[PDB]
Amino acid sequence: RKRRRHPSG
Amino acid sequence: EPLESQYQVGPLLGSGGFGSVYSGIRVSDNLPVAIKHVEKDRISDWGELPNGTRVPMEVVLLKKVSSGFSGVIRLLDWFERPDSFVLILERPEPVQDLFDFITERGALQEELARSFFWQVLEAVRHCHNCGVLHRDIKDENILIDLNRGELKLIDFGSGALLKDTVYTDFDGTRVYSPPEWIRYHRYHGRSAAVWSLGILLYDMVCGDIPFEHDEEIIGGQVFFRQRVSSECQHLIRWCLALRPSDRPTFEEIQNHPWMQDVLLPQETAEIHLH
Ligand SMILES: [Cl-]
Ligand code: NA
What we know:
Chain A is low in regular secondary structure. Chain A contains no helices and no strands. It is classed as transferase/transferase inhibitor.
């Protein structure tokens, strides 16, 4: 199942 | 005095909603550094120093916390250029960020989650004692010094001065943001921080964050996808209480039964990291 980063900015 | 002769610049470590960060070595004494560049055009929050010269809030916030030794990254120096500010930060070596660490290892053993989470708690208390609210606590913004077993909080670019009144602005990470921000575009600092720590702890013990969509964030249901002790699930669930006033204080978190008998940082490196 897909684990990913998440941008803040 | 000038930036180029005083640091040897090495390779890009990363870039994104934070900027462009290079590995470097301070020539004075070969100290490992990280050289972060931020475009002036992309900075929305500005402060002023005791000096009186005007800087990005990020610089204001790093000076306020870089007082002494801690689980917060230290600002060694900074420079103003025509279209940017360059920040010279500490660089532990060898290092891995907690996001890659959890990707590589999967769900962490509770003993290891406990030591890490405890150290994140101490770092955030530090920021709060120094008048700083980070606003972007997440695995991506935590470095692990692999030899010392010490965690460092990085990237204060979304932070603010800590206040007790309401915040109506936010530029941190949405999947760590609390339900009161999602629905009403308002939060209080401490209680929002505790929610994000709840996300981080679930992330540690389960191997990924609990929520991706708004509807999940506001829905108030934590499904555990890994075997997690009852005491730990209780702490996570308390941190992710929908009503902010129902969340625990940092003290209550640190006195929680699941938090007792934490490993020292050296013990953590020795058992879990070498
Ligand atoms: Cl958002
Ligand atoms: Na380098």
